[PDB]
Structure formats: structure tokens, C-alpha cells
């Protein structure tokens, strides 16, 4: 929760007040530090669920066969 944290407002207010005046990769970098959409942070979000799921699917067949109908 980013509330009450002013240094998290700067990192955001620097990307906002550009509109479209800059390439979107330069805008991204002003917040994240990279130049491309990354799928790593989406996987840190669902970590405590991924663990639990890997534990719940012990006795099942993770995957699917594309011929049953």
C-alpha cells in the first residue's frame, strides 16, 4: 500500500506529466528501470497462490489433451 509515502509519488508524477510527448519506452523506464513489458512482477504477485496450487494438484493431471470432446 503506497499511501503516506511521498517518494512513491515522485516516481509516478514523473511518468504522468509527459502525456505522449515521449516514446513510451522512455516513459516506462522513468518508473521501472527497463524498456519492455515484463512478466516477472506478475508472477511475484501470485506467489502464495502458486505454492498452494502446486501443493493441491499433487493427485491430478496438470495439463490437458486436445482430443477428448
Amino acid at each position: 500500500d503506497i499511501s503516506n509515502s511521498t517518494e512513491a509519488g515522485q516516481k509516478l508524477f514523473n511518468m504522468l506529466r509527459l502525456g505522449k510527448s515521449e516514446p513510451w519506452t522512455l516513459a516506462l523506464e522513468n518508473v521501472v528501470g527497463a524498456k519492455n513489458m515484463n512478466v516477472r512482477p506478475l508472477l511475484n504477485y501470485f506467489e502464495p497462490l502458486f505454492t498452494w496450487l502446486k501443493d493441491q494438484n499433487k493427485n491430478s493431471f496438470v495439463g490437458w489433451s486436445t482430443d477428448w470432446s
Binding site: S3, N4, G9, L49
Partner: protein
Amino acid sequence: GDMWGRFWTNLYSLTVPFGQKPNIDVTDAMVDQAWDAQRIFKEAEKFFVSVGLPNMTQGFWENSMLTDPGNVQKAVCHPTAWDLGKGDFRILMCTKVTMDDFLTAHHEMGHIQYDMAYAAQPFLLRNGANEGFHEAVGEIMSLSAATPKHLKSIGLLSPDFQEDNETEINFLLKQALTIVGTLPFTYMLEKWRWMVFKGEIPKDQW
């Protein structure tokens, strides 16, 4: 869940991990404190000003539709923000004192706080850095106001309230049904269209 399979949200009632532990809702602690559709849009503004972004503007409080008229005067109640230009902004939404509207308040003030920031650019340079940037700020605004560490501070969610590691799974799975469940669908649907538009799929194998 739904007609096409875009979102798997409606499968929640069949897959809730722990059906007994109920979710976190404050729709009721709100009515007990007389929370009208102005206490909400003040809590949102306070949230934003707390971060560092600026206040709202007078013209925002005057000419907005922060509650449905309901009389002979009708409207269209789909929530949204407006950037009419020249330096006035306004929100149009018929808000019911609820929780899902306590989130949409932050979602929309997100757009408004985006627009107020780049209103010093030439008229054609007023938009998100690309198409996916605009609604991706509203989300992180509403994503960080539904957390008990924040509800437990603004006044709702009575203080001696421990969250247990089973409500957290109850919550993350409700998210994954809406976020992750829709990624393969989106990707597959745009792959199909990209391939159809370049003749890579003959017109008899669509």
C-alpha cells in the same frame, strides 16, 4: 462463467477454497457511520493528496454528478471521468454507498489525476504514453485501497481484526480468476485476428 469465457469470475462460488471464512467487506460498517456519496470522494482525494499528487479543483466539486438525480431528470449512469478541456474536469457516476463503488471512486479519480498532470502539453499530446497506460493507473490506484492495512486505517474494519492466511488465499484466487484467467483468451483472440488480416488463414479455415 460467461458467454464467451473472457473472465472466469463467476466460477467463484464453485471454487472458493475455504467456503467458511467469509471475504472482507465493509459495505455495512459504512452505513453505520452514515457514509454518503460525498464522504467517499473525500476519502479518495485524501488518499491521493497523501501520496504527493495535488488536490482537486473547485470546478470539480461544483459541476460533477457525484450522485444520481433519480427524479424526472435522468442520465446514463456508467461511471467515467471527463476532461472537457481548458482546465476543468469532472466525474459522472451514480454512486451507491457500497464497497465496489468505494473502489470505483479511486479508479476514476485515478484518470482525473492523470489528466490534471499533463494539461500543459499541446492539444495533440494529451493522452497516455500509449493505449494501455491510461487504464493501468486507475488499476494500481484501486488495487492499493482494498487492502486491510488501509481499510483498517481510514476508519472501517474495526481495529482488533486479524487477517488469517486463509482469507489471503480466498482473495488471491478471486483475483487470479479475473486477471490470469483472461490472459490466454486475450492472446488467442488477437493472434487469430492478426493472422486473419494477413491472409495467413484462408477464408475456409477460419
